[PDB]
Symmetry: C2
């Protein structure tokens, strides 16, 4: 099965760690905080890693049946499950259920109870994925969702819920959104397991290319908190493409060219390594290229293939 990547333009593709369109290409240096994303992890052969789901609407969210606080503003407790509705395998090969948020923040969103015969329900909600919240323990099969300023009488056990992400909190008093900082999936008192491996380009002069999106920020109606971004290694359209394809990797990396039709030419070239990340010969920072261009696979290359400088 011959290897390929989607011919879709970047501004048509979506972030694999957050519900948002790609609106930027940035290069990231080998900082102290090593890229260790659990979502948006796919090999060029289409092997999904960590908590990566193909279900785009299940990204950076939680879902499952409500349970009583005993058995573990208004607190909601979920028996977390996978996107397709099947049980989460606790002693399986994932750190958490697929689509589970893979960073620390207070994630603002909507708690949804969409199929209830007594009547559908939803409410403003948030999830604290920082170590500060001991009840964020999806690795052990439960997590706490906070319904903000309501929810009493609606969080009874035995009903299907989703938590769907909108924003992170910002502002001086509130917890820091740190997208490169993994949460404690088992809570403070227990360890993570089966994490997808860190991403750190080995070769000199090669730095990581990330796909950027805007990260909305909630600061309780002030409109004073600084704007945020969120990054991923491969857009979802890449991940679904690679997964469906199942093409054997014939070398350490795939040489892709970023093609811009209005320019009638290739603008830069990059290496997509088998492990599922792109690198460029470029210094850290934003790439000032138009996003109405697409990646094209031209050849299998060695890790020692020297890229043209961006």
């Amino acid at each position: 099965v011959s290897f390929s990547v989607p011919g879709l333009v970047v501004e048509d593709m979506s972030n694999s760690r957050w519900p948002a369109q790609i609106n930027g290409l940035v290069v990231r240096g080998n900082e102290a905080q090593v890229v260790h994303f659990q979502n948006g992890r796919c090999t060029t052969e289409g092997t999904l890693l960590g908590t990566t789901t193909l279900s785009i609407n299940s990204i950076c969210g939680l879902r499952g049946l409500s349970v009583s606080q005993a058995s573990v503003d208004t607190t909601l407790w979920l028996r977390v499950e996978e996107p397709d509705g099947r049980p989460y395998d606790i002693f399986g090969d994932q750190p958490a259920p697929l689509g589970t948020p893979d960073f620390t923040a207070v994630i603002v969103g909507t708690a949804i109870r969409p199929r209830t015969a007594s009547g559908a329900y939803l409410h403003d909600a948030y999830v604290d994925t920082t170590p500060g919240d001991a009840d964020f323990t999806p690795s052990t099969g439960n997590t706490k969702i906070v319904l903000r300023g309501g929810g009493s009488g609606h969080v009874g056990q035995g009903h299907y819920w989703q938590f769907r992400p909108i924003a992170v909190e910002g502002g001086g008093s509130r917890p820091q959104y740190q997208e490169y900082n993994l949460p404690d999936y088992a809570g403070p008192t227990a360890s993570n397991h089966d994490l997808a491996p860190p991403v750190a380009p080995r070769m000199p002069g090669e730095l990581l290319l990330l796909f950027e999106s805007d990260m909305p920020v909630w600061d309780n109606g002030a409109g004073a908190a600084p704007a945020q971004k969120i990054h991923c290694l491969l857009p979802n359209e890449f991940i679904t493409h690679l997964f469906d394809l199942q093409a054997p990797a014939l070398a350490e990396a795939a040489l892709l060219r970023y093609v811009h039709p209005d320019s009638g030419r290739t603008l830069f070239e990059c290496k997509l390594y088998r492990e599922g990340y792109m690198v460029v010969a470029a210094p850290a920072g934003r790439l000032n290229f138009p996003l109405d261009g697409y990646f094209r696979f031209d050849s299998w290359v060695s890790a020692f293939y020297i890229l043209s400088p961006v």
Copy 2:
């Protein structure tokens, strides 16, 4: 260029008219209200129709720069633009900007101002797409977003906004959600134009196959309103696949088989017509099939190909 469809399972794919995973296959009869979807419209050759965008996060939403009410709870006024940030061509070949909602309801969501240097902002919002609100006029380049119980001082002109869908309203007094009922894109005082064509199976015994999702409902914290669904003709993953492929259609329809590996066999068959819709030889109602199966293209067939009963 040989034709194909994604080998992705249905419960992994997403709705082309609303932010949700597919959780159902239903067959729809030839009802009085004809399928006239503007989103989720793609031909087997990969031609996008109506307001169809590949940008999944831009589906059933609005975005653009804020403008003054003069130049046209707290009212926000947007100069609507396309997902990629480029201007909406009013006298072009679309009824509205891509991703514009294609049904009548009060759509609940979040108004997001994510890039503002003075500080990012968001707020609880809704969009009335019924004829009752004359200010839903995206065909003419502006639309009103209502910020619910706040927003004063934040809706100033010259800033980029998005409206992102969460739910529709429900409850006896509130306006009815009608997913097969197109809005007046130019408002009450003007006509629509360049609508994607109605979908209505011609051949006897062939009825429309639709991909179902849950539709969340907002009823102001009551939780008493009846649960809802929303449907589309083809999942986004189909649409991206067909678009990237650009495969010539060798016949009126593509014969697909729904394959279930756990059963080690084909469960039913369908015809995907060139115009971008699937039909089954089956009566109206829910198809009780497991959604961990995938569609497979086996042959080009005429419109007179007799399908096996489901």
